[PDB]
Ligand binder design. Structure first.
Ligand SMILES: CCCCCCCCCCCCCCCC(=O)O
Ligand SMILES: [Cl-]
Ligand SMILES: [Cl-]
Length: 174
């Protein structure tokens, strides 16, 4: 009876790009189809004076046949009418790395502790998501405090994803 239509999902009110800048460690991920980033995922967000948000990311990706590389990725965000909803053009510093353009929603954050991100790459015909991914980020690479963890769990459930995350390990691979 809970609403899993993407159009129903709340996102961060009055999202502040500047406050969101800096280092975010991925603690957990819900994978899309054909998953790319595997683990050791760290993102760096910036805003320029134009107010244009961008990011870089490092992580282990596993090219099939069991070949691990540390991907170095770049993203730039185009604003929409909602301050928390963006279009993210992304690519790798190496041209053979995955590129594309995904929706990028900041579902919730308190800026200095946790963030929940969401992307629906493809809708179902009933408005639910056919192919989604989601990152939970922490400022502290050692994880979230309990109050933040509990808030995040609520947000995960609201996205209809709470059963579908896996933990992201950080072990200096990159
Ligand atoms: C959304 C993660 C951080 C945002 C920083 C954008 C920098 C490019 C990251 C590329 C994400 C594309 C792969 C995401 C889906 C996946 O890993 O399976
Ligand atoms: Cl709990
Ligand atoms: Cl669960």
């Amino acid at each position: 009876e809970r609403d899993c239509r993407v159009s129903s999902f709340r996102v961060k009110e009055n999202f502040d790009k500047a406050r969101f800048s800096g280092t975010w460690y991925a603690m957990a991920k819900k994978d899309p189809e054909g998953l790319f980033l595997q683990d050791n995922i760290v993102a760096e967000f910036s805003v320029d004076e134009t107010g244009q948000m961008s990011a870089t990311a490092k992580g282990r990706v596993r090219l099939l046949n069991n070949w691990d590389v540390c991907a170095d990725m770049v993203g730039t965000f185009t604003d929409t009418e909602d301050p928390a909803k963006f279009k993210m053009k992304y690519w790798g510093v190496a041209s053979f790395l995955q590129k594309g353009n995904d929706d990028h929603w900041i579902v919730d954050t308190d800026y200095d502790t946790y963030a929940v991100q969401y992307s629906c790459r493809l809708l179902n015909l009933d408005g639910t998501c056919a192919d989604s991914y989601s990152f939970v980020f922490s400022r502290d690479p050692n994880g979230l405090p309990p109050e933040a963890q509990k808030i995040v769990r609520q947000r995960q459930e609201e996205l209809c994803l709470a059963r579908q995350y896996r933990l992201i390990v950080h072990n200096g691979y990159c």
